[PDB]
Each structure stands twice: as structure tokens, then as C-alpha cells.
């Protein structure tokens, strides 16, 4: 049903690679080395405009391919660093939050939610991947992780907001992974970037309660982001 | 690019028709009787993109008449699905139906599109139960779904969306069924509104009732409705 014929795949350049599907369509394609490891039955059921769209797979012979939409602006971390306005930055945030809200509603977790692992289409729209979901990247991890539930993605998302409004800085750049994890436990948090209003920082900051059961749901972050957008 | 060769389409039964595209896929097929100049719509369907919009698959333009192919939404239009399934829902599910539509409509509002007839008859429901709206026939007087300023922009749809909430939570009841259209207009001009259905909580109905300010500019945007709704869902 989703089985693509590699006859129909023309390969174009490493970046995971740019390719064409049936000669027409712009696609990105990935080639497994990892083992058997059931993921894609998640990708095949999940369905949201802010997730990287699955086009198909090549399993009927070896090695394996996954084909997705070509997000022509690449990864967000670079896109930030490569012109913006604070409303655009707030949409970028909205986009990720929608995806994550959807994922949250279906009891899934991202587990490495950062700007390098976000992705940007030709229309500037930011999407997240549904491949590799769960059901220790130090600077995106909450206290309870540095010593698997909804609220660690929330922490990660708070930092992603910081990442965005920073135009892509190394978060806590001053410190090592060790000092960062120490300092995080002291109560140190990320300082309000220049480009975020007080209203914005409040969203990102609400993600960083030392207690996971005080942090908002994506549900509420999205609600909070809608609110500011006017 | 979106051109579908009608070789590859089957025409199984009316419902707009159900068919099979390329033999594999379920589809819906709309055949026009309107013009064959007013295609200019379809570029809008082609540029919009959102899960809560009935997804466009393609068209049959090269030859006559015209066809619009969309995804099959196996549970049909919403009004009938409320009534068929009246005893099967739970109040959390009714609110998701609201969320679904509010999402579509927020996207559309964020792109300056108006629906025109936002109402439970014109929404559709897939095998999953998810609710969607058509982006065909947008713009840039169904009496019961219309605000005061229509009966004599963005907030028009808002009013209609309130009645939509009332519809869902009412399990498909005719809004203002006591009254005729002429009556209904007076009572809306009097400030009478739609009462709170059994199944709607205070928070829910507050949200639906916020769509019906006499003053359009005092009505919320779909941004705030979705926020409101997301806010309630916890
Ligand atoms: C950061 C380097 C970079 O910009 N890479 C890049 C550039 C353009 C396009 C992509 C891209 N487009 N689609 C994908 N998909 C990745 C992917 C998944 F996330 C999940 C499954 C399969 C794939 Cl191919 N990357 C990347
Ligand atoms: C209202 C009666 C009913 O139940 N109709 C019904 C039943 C099942 C499926 C559909 C359906 N599925 N897709 C569509 N698409 C409608 C459509 C648009 F909204 C816009 C352009 C083209 C089409 Cl076909 N209807 C309806």
C-alpha cells in the first residue's frame, strides 16, 4: 500500500538525501545502516500538517529506505542563523507546539526536541518528525532527567523557544554539560532573549518548573501562544 | 500536476459520488452541472494545506464536465452523524469535534478566508471520527447561522461557529426549532439567544455564547476560541 518501487526513486544529493519520486516529486530519502526495529506503523497512522509527511518505504529488498516530503529550508537551527520578525518567530513556535499537541494527545513523546531536529519547508513552515518517537541531550533535559513522561518534552520545548528567539545560540553556552546540569538544579534558567516580550518569555519559562506536575501541557502552551499572537 | 485521468477513476454511487482512484484508494468525486470559468477556486484548494480540511486529491479539467476529487470521509456529513450516533458520544468527544473545526477555521482566518455556510450539514467526518471543513467555495444568508449585521468579515463565521457548537452539543437539533425564519430574525434582533443544551457545561456554553455578541468587534477570533477550547479540554 505504502510500498514504493526504488525504480521510481532518482537520488540527488546528501544533506539523508534529496531525491525525486516518479520523476515529478521533490522528496528527501533516508537509508538505514540500527537493525527489525515497527517504527513506521506509527508514521503510517499519524497524520498532521506540522509533521514531516511520510511518502513511503522500500522494504521488499535491502537496504531499507524511508521517503518523506522535502523540507527545502532544512533544519531550523541553521535557518535561524542563516531577516526575521517577532511574529514569524512566534509562528515557528506555534507550528512545533501544534505538532506536539497532536503527539501529546496520542500519548507519544519526542525525546530529542531541539532546533537542529526541527525542519523547515519552502513556505517557512516548521515541522517535527514522527520517526523515533517514544511511547539525555543535556541542555534540553529537565532536572528529573539529569539524575519518560509528557513534561520532559515540555522542558525541551521551552528551550526550543529560547533557541528560536535567540536566533539560534548554544543554550547556557558559558557552561559545560556538567556545570549546566549543576546550575539547572540550583534554579538557574535561561535569560529572556532580546526578541521575546515579557508575554513570550512567560510561555517559555513556564516550561521550566523544577516540578514536572506544575509545567503546562502542550494543550496549554498552544493556548498561551494563540493568546499572544493577537 | 493535479490532473487526474478519468481512465483511473471508478464511479460507484451517489451520496457528489463515492469511487476508486487508480483502483486502490477510496475517494469522493464532485461533478459540477455554476460555470466552467469559476477553476479559479481550485487554485485556492491547491495552495491551502491543513489536516482539518477535506484534502484535495485532484481534478478532471482537460475534458468536460469538471470533477473535483477529494478524500473519502466515511461517516458523511456531521448533521447525520450526530443523529445516527446520538447515544454513542461522550462530552469529551463533542469538544474534540469543536476543536477539529475551530482548527480548520483558525487556519482559514489566519489566511483571510471566510467559510460562508459554516454549519453541521457542511462539515464531514472520517472513519476515525475526525471533523473537517471544505476549502472549496470560500470567500475573501442561512438565517439561523447568521449574525444581526447579516440579517439586515471574520466575525460572521464566528457567530455561525457558535451555532455549530450548539448543533454538536444538541445532537443535531434544528437551532431555534420553536421559531420560523422571520420569527428567528426578530428574536435575534431582540437579543434572545440559543439556550444552553443539556450536554454543554458552563465553560463550554460560555465559549459558545461568546460568539453571539451583538457587536461583531466584541466577538472573539478563532485564535481565542481554540485557546478557550484547548484551555477547557484539561
Ligand atoms: C540540517 C541539515 C539540513 O538542512 N538537512 C536537510 C535539508 C533539506 C531537507 C531535509 C529533509 N527533508 N526531509 C527530511 N526528512 C528527514 C526524515 C525524517 F525526519 C524522518 C524520516 C525520514 C526522513 Cl528522510 N529531511 C534535511
Ligand atoms: C451529506 C450526505 C453524506 O453523508 N455525504 C457524504 C458521505 C460520505 C462522504 C462524503 C464526502 N467525502 N468527501 C466529500 N467531499 C466533498 C467535496 C468537497 F467538500 C469539496 C470539493 C469536492 C468534494 Cl467531493 N464528501 C459525503
UniProtKB/Swiss-Prot annotation, chain A:
Changing residue 144 to K: In XLA; severe. Predominantly expressed in B-lymphocytes. A motif (CAV1-binding) lies at residues 155-162. Signal peptide: none annotated. Clofedanol binds at residues 68-71, 133. Belongs to the protein kinase superfamily. Tyr protein kinase family. TEC subfamily. This is Tyrosine-protein kinase BTK. It comes from Homo sapiens. The gene is BTK.
Amino acid at each position: 500500500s505504502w510500498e514504493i518501487d526504488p525504480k521510481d526513486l532518482t537520488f540527488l544529493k546528501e544533506l539523508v538525501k534529496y531525491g525525486k519520486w516518479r520523476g515529478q516529486y521533490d522528496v528527501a530519502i533516508k537509508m538505514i545502516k540500527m537493525s527489525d526495529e515497527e517504527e513506521a506503523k506509527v508514521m503510517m497512522n499519524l497524520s498532521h500538517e506540522k509533521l514531516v509527511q511520510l511518502y513511503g518505504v522500500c522494504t521488499k529488498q535491502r537496504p531499507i529506505f524511508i521517503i518523506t516530503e522535502y523540507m527545502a529550508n532544512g533544519c531550523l537551527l541553521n535557518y535561524l542563523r542563516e531577516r526575521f520578525q517577532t511574529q514569524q518567530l512566534l509562528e515557528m513556535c506555534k507550528d512545533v507546539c501544534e505538532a506536539m499537541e497532536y503527539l501529546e494527545s496520542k500519548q507519544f513523546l519526542h525525546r530529542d526536541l531541539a532546533a537542529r531536529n526541527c525542519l523547515v519547508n519552502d513556505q517557512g513552515v516548521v515541522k517535527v518528525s514522527d520517526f523515533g518517537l517514544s511511547r539525555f541531550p543535556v541542555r534540553w533535559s529537565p532536572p528529573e532527567v539529569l539524575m519518560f513522561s509528557s513534561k520532559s518534552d515540555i522542558w525541551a520545548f521551552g528551550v526550543l523557544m529560547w533557541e528560536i528567539y535567540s536566533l539560534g545560540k548554544m543554550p547556557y553556552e558559558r557552561f559545560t554539560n556538567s556545570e549546566t546540569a549543576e546550575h539547572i538544579a540550583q534554579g538557574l534558567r535561561l535569560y529572556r532573549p532580546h526578541l521575546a516580550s515579557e508575554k513570550v518569555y512567560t510561555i517559555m519559562y513556564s516550561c521550566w518548573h523544577e516540578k514536572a506536575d506544575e509545567r503546562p501541557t502542550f494543550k496549554i502552551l498552544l493556548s498561551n501562544i494563540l493568546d499572544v499572537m493577537d
